[PDB]
Structure 1
Amino acid sequence: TETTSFSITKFSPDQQNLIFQGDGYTTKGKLTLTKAVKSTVGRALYSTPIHIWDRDTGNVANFVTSFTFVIDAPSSYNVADGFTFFIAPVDTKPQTGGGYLGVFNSKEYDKTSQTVAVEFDTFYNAAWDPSNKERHIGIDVNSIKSVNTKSWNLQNGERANVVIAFNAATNVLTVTLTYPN
């Protein structure tokens, strides 16, 4: 039996148990991944490696994460590219930016990626995004093209609460996003 658990409700200028990459940094109690500037990437990883399955037992972990984030764009029609929560190998580095969101390199299934991501995608990339062109939540498995998407209305400058949960018995990954009004 391994477990692991942690809670941060305010980020220190010196958050030593995070790894920052790109423009990632902490300022004011908060974790900033990008400011509102063109063509940039930020990531932040929790520093400890998690044991997610065991080759020996074939057990897989149950897990739940929750977080609050804000997207703050100059308007409803000037917003890109979006935001992920991702799970990846221990030595992960930023991948292609722009609509590949810092996590993937192609819309083709790339089994070397070994990355699962939940995206909150704010920009229609015609090559892979759902054709209704709306903004959306997706489950991504080794690809920028989601296996499943939910249309979602961005509320600009508002705090969303996300919970993401994985049931090991069922292999179901659930994502919920909530706004106050």
Structure 2
Amino acid sequence: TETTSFSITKFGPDQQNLIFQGDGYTTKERLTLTKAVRNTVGRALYSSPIHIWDSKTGNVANFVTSFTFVIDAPNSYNVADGFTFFIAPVDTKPQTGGGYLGVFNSKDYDKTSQTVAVEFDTFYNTAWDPSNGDRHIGIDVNSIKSINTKSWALQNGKEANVVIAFNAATNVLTVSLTYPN
């Protein structure tokens, strides 16, 4: 057994246990990943590496995470690109911005990526997003083209609470977004 847990309820000016990348900073009790400025990237990572599976044993971890985020856009139509909760190699640095959401660099599976990310995607990139053109939740394994997606209506400026859980016995990864209105 190995367990890692932490909770930050109000982020504060010198939040030393987070690694900030790109334009991530903490400000006014929030973790601000991007400002409403065009073409930036911001990322933030928990400081400790976590052990997700063991080679000796074949054992994979069970985990759960929840967080509440706010996407604040200029208006409901000019919103982009999105947000992601990702799991990546320990030395992960920002990847391609724009519609690649700073985690990936391609629409085709790339085993080198080693990144699993749940995305809250607000912009339709015709080359890889679902043909309905909707805003959406998705699970990305090693490519920005999601292996599954659910359509989502963005409520601009509202807080959304998200729970993501992984059950190692069944390998099911589950994500729930709830707008408290």
SS at match of 1:31: strand
CA RMSD of aligned residues (A): 0.4
Pair 1:58 & 2:58 matched: yes
SS at match of 1:71: strand
Superposition deviation, residue 82 in structure 1: 0.3
Query: What is the rounded CA distance, in whole Å, between the counterparts of 1:16 and 1:5 in structure 2?
Result: 16
Query: What is the rounded CA distance, in whole Å, between the counterparts of 2:80 and 2:12 in structure 1?
Result: 27
Q: TM-score, normalised by structure 1?
A: 0.99
Number of residue pairs matched by the alignment: 181
Alignment of 1:157-172 (within 5 A): 157-172=157-172
Cα deviation code 1:16-64 (max 9, x no counterpart) = 1000000000011110000100000000000100000000011000000
Superposition deviation, residue 147 in structure 1: 0.3
Query: What is the rounded CA distance, in whole Å, between the counterparts of 2:76 and 2:132 in structure 1?
Result: 17
Cα deviation code 1:151-170 (max 9, x no counterpart) = 00000000000000000000
Query: What is the rounded CA distance, in whole Å, between the counterparts of 2:5 and 2:22 in structure 1?
Result: 26
Query: What is the rounded CA distance, in whole Å, between the counterparts of 2:80 and 2:54 in structure 1?
Result: 38
Superposition deviation, residue 180 in structure 1: 1.2
SS at match of 1:166: strand
SS at match of 1:99: helix
Structure 1: give runs of 5+ residues left out of the alignment: none
Match of 1:143 in 2: 143
Identical amino acids, percent of aligned pairs: 90
Superposition deviation, residue 12 in structure 1: 1.4
SS at match of 2:99: helix
Query: What is the rounded CA distance, in whole Å, between the counterparts of 1:61 and 1:99 in structure 2?
Result: 30
Cα deviation code 1:57-107 (max 9, x no counterpart) = 110000000000000000111100000000000000000000000000000
SS at match of 2:125: coil
Superposition deviation, residue 11 in structure 1: 0.7
Alignment of 1:15-94 (within 5 A): 15-94=15-94
Q: TM-score, normalised by structure 2?
A: 0.99
